[PDB]
Amino acid sequence: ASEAKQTVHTGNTVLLMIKGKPVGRAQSASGQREYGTTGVYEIGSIMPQEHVYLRYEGTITVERLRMKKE
């Protein structure tokens, strides 16, 4: 219930800091990180025997209401 005891993160308990300053009047921030993980298959056996990692495809989107300036 209270901030000092809740177990979960919420929109009201987080601040988004860019270059040392807090972002004002954002609406959502969402981040996708995909490793391009792929399994290694084989003749004679139908199932893959390990996964391996290709490219660190890492992204964050910021959506914000336009401050009158700044």
Partner: protein, 88 residues
């Protein structure tokens, strides 16, 4: 597939005297009505198994046609031979 490979290997290897004195292969293309006498082409029996479809074999065959199977061998045809070919 292994039986096929072993038949083709045995047919190919025994032909080391220029040409087998017996038959060529016989190819019963039953699906559309047609019949041929055929010999292994110089492409041969190419066998492969890629990553895609791991548990399925694939085979590639190429063949050259000697003649229709309706017709008997050229040299074996019984000529007229009337009179006497072996005069005394």
């Amino acid at each position: 597939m292994e039986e096929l490979q072993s038949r083709v290997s045995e047919y190919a290897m025994q032909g080391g005297s220029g040409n087998v004195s017996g038959s060529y292969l016989q190819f019963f293309n039953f699906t559309d009505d047609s019949y041929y006498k055929v010999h292994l082409a110089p492409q041969g029996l190419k066998i492969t198994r890629s990553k895609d479809e791991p548990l399925l074999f694939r085979y590639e065959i190429t063949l050259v046609v000697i003649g229709s199977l309706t017709e008997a061998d050229r040299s074996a045809v019984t000529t007229e031979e009337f009179g006497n070919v072996k005069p005394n």
